[PDB]
């Protein structure tokens, strides 16, 4: 069931307040991003290890010092994996 409007209670506002639940803690598998792996320039620097089929399609991000956005996701193409890394402006 979708919706277009900001839930009201998140403007009460807002300390006071319910003393609402925490989100769950970070599970161990999002601790590591395969992009940080370049075992491979020996000699094909594009090779990554096999991903982990839980983490297909999760956005990852990275600091550039260049004033653009670094984004990436991993996906199955037929039986092979493509991690695409996008460099993109903000405007």
């Amino acid at each position: 069931q979708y919706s277009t409007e900001i839930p009201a209670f998140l403007t009460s506002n807002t300390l006071q307040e319910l003393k609402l639940p925490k989100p769950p803690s970070l599970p161990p598998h999002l601790e590591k991003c395969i992009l940080n792996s370049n075992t491979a320039y020996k000699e094909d620097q594009s090779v990554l290890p096999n991903p982990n089929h839980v983490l297909l399609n999760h956005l990852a991000a990275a600091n550039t010092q260049l004033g653009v956005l670094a984004l990436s996701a991993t996906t199955r193409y037929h039986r092979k994996y493509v991690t695409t890394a996008m460099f993109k402006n903000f405007d």
Binding site: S25, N57, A70, L71
Partner: protein, 116 residues
Amino acid sequence: KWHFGVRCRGDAPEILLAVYRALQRAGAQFTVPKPVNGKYRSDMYTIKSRWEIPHCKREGKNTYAYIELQLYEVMPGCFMLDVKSNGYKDIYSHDLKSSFPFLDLCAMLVCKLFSA
């Protein structure tokens, strides 16, 4: 340097608010918490959104993109806002999983979170 999602600091529902507003500014649509009689349930930090895909909107095709967000406490005071793709579906028929436009949308979202 690479890590999943986008980092967040501060107050958990303060961040939940910002994400909600950020969706609203992109024109995404979203699920919303529903309490247990009381009483807000921890899954409120699980947001399913739906995004009209602009270049399909340009044809005038009704094709949508499904994106799930999830908050996780990392340290005390530090959070990962995790973003994952549930795929695309047009209102019609009749089996690739591209990262696009999923990545172009996370790009939009991130612009909204920051221009806030």
